Each structure stands twice: as structure tokens, then as C-alpha cells.
Amino acid sequence: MLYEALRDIAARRPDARAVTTADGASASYAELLDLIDRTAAGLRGHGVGAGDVIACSLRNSIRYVALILAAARIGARYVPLMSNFDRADIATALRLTGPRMIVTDHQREFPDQAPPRVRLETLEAATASPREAGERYDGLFRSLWTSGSTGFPKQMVWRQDRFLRERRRWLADTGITADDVFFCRHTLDVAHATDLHVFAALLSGAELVLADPDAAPDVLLRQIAERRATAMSALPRHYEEYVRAAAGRPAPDLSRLRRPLCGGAYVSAAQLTDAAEVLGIHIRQIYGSTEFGLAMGNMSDVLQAGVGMVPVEGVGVRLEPLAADRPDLGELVLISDCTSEGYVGSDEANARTFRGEEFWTGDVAQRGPDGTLRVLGRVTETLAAAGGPLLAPVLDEEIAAGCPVLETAALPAHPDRYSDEVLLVLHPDPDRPEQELRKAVAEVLDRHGLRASIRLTDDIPHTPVGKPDKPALRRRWESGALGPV
């Protein structure tokens, strides 16, 4: 179904630009469909067929885009071997998926019994296999991975029909047209790339710009302007990087960015105001998940500090209240007819997450007077603060910016309860006095009515992008029934 929809678009504008890479390469819609059809031809030539699973160990390239579409066209299913997978995690990922082959384009050590590796470029046959009339695949076409757990990530599978419907709904709500140019600086291994940029552009007849996820933010900022991008999605940390790179300099030319989307983590009022002042854009808040697709956003071209989102037209939302005291504050529960098919081989996770027709996000949202919803963070991160429930990322940003710490991680002190007690792990700035740390910390905590148990340490587990790994911090210092660790 995905190939078909792509082919219809290509037929109307065969010679229109479809994909541009930051470093020069390009393809029209007709050229891209030819590459897909030639990649289908080579995949068939290598014994791949419907139902097979194709693991991918690949950098961002037009060829990787064609491979995804070729897989979908022949009724195969692709799965990324995430770049942070080491040899052991590759073995595990292979045990869970059982792929027919690993398509590779860079040196990498695979485990001993791995499926055969095939170099990406050699899958492009010289002679294209035209898609035959009467061929359509509506079922599974991809396995994807969760993120942010200390465990091996959970496998998610999507059907083509549900994905295509979900993307068309978002594209309608969001106002995407063929005029748009999507700037994608994430690895194609993740839905942040493939959903918000690749299929968003191609199912629209728009243009996709493939950038290097490893490029420094100054480089990406020049490229966002040069390539005239109108739409992109990035994490808060990515916008903070952009801002820092541009702060104090004459503003970049981001005038074409009518859809600068941000989601995936806490986006503060200060981040949004910063982006306006430094980058001269109004960041548009979005919200979703690889499990669900896109659920909410705020496409208004205003500074969105202190403003929430609304459901994507066709998505249902309710709050499961944390307490009958505050109905406007609860776990966010979502309703859709076109989500993923859930988790592979994880019965506990599916049971807690897919409860019938409903999708339980495990995130805390709040309604505001204006009827919008602000997603505040994980339910497991709620603190009972002055002024209502407060989510730890909020306190983390406050402490980090106002106190002489190199980093901080705030967690609720006790696993099961909603308390004003915070477990506060501080990495002290060794250059600054300790009394200055505790005065500054006391101020933040008192601003929120919080009680804290403080753990000073420079032995912080970090994520690969340098943030505290709060799950590992909790497993070490969380309190028990008999007292503090």
C-alpha cells in the first residue's frame, strides 16, 4: 500500500525533486521509484521475498530510503540494527527478528551465526523490476525499537495500512503540502526520521532533505537555511544545541520554517522563548510515540511558552486522573484505529499499554484553562510540589540553570508514592564552593515546596548523548522500606 501511494504521487510529478542529501545527491520521484524497483529486483535476486525480515546496518542515504520502500513493496519487513547495539545486542536483536540478511554499508563486527551481510549498493540491480498489477501488501513491513529503557528495547511492528492511514491523518491536520521541504537530521533507523520526515514528505509529494545525524549544529543550521527547509522535527536537546550555536550571533535565516516541530521530551517555556529570541522561530509542540504515531500538537505560529497542544484531528484523548481531587491532571490515554500492532514477545508491556481500544501512554498531562493539554513527563517522575504535581525534568532544568552543578538528576524519593520528597543527585562543580551549591539548591527546592535527600557524586551514569541515566540512578540510590541508601 505504501509503494502504491508513492507510485500514484510519482506518476503525477515524475520529474519533481523528491530527495536531496546535504552533501549533493538527489533523486526525482521517478528516479526514486526506479531505485526502489531496482532494489526490489536485487532483493529478489538475493532470495528475499514476502514475509522475510531484512536487518539494516546503514547510514542515511537515498539508497536506504529506497530499501525501506522496496521492502514494503515486496511484502518484506525491515528492522534496524541500531548503531548503539554492540556485538552482543546485535545477537539479541537477531534472535528476536530472525532476518534473512543484513544489508550493510560500513565496517562492523557481527556475531558468529548472523545472516549473510549484503553491501547496500549491490542490491541496486541494473534492470528495474516493475511492480506487477495486483500486488499489494497491507501487513507488517517494519520492526522498530523503543528507547530510554535500561533493558534491551522492546520490538514494535507496524502494518502498512495502519501506518499509511496514520501518516495521512497527521499530514492533513498539520497542513503538509507538496510545497514543503523536510529536513531530517536523525538516523533513518528511527521513526523520528522515517515518520516525521521521510514518509511525511513522500506521501505528500513534498521534498526530503537527508542530513548527517553526526554533523555539528552549526553545520546543520547552515544546511537548514541553504536547503530552504519548511518542516523538521527534533528533540528539545537538538533545539538547545541550535540555540547555543546561534546565541549572540546575527539570527539565521529560518524564515521558511513554517513547521519547526519539537517533541520527545520536556520542552520548557524558556526553551521556547529562547528559540524565538535566538533562532527567530516559533517552535511547534508535537507529541506521540513509535507505538502510537502522532497524537497531539500545536501548529499555531505563536510563541508557545505556557501553551499546550490539541489532539490531531481523528485522535481521541482522555486523562486517567491521578486523584479525583484534580481531574485536569492524569495519565494521558489515547484512542486510535491506526496504531502499531503492539510489542513483539512482551506480554506484560502490551497488557499495561494496549488496553483494548485504548493506548496508555504512561505520561502525565494537564488541561489548562484554554483547553489545551500539556504533557509534563513520565508518571513515574511525578513530585507533589507547591502549586500541584511537578515532573522531575522541570526541576532538573531549573537546578541545572540556576545552581553551580555540572549535572543533576531529580527522582521521586520512593517508588510507589506521590510525595514532596525528592531524591536529588548532584554532580558538583568542583571549582565552586559547596556552601554555594547547597544555598542555590535550597532556593530551588523551597520555590517548589520540595523536601530533598541529596546525593553528591561525580559518578553519574550517562546516556550516549551525555544526560544522566535516571533509571540507573534510581536502581542505586532509591530509598527502601527501611530507610535511605
Author numbering: 1 to 485
Manuscript excerpt for this entry:
Here we provide a full characterization of the pathways that nature deploys to assemble peptides with β-lactone warheads, which are potent proteasome inhibitors with promising anticancer activity. Warhead assembly involves a three-step cryptic methylation sequence, which is likely required to reduce unfavorable electrostatic interactions during the sterically demanding β-lactonization. Amide-bond synthetase and adenosine triphosphate (ATP)-grasp enzymes couple amino acids to the β-lactone warhead, generating the bioactive peptide products.
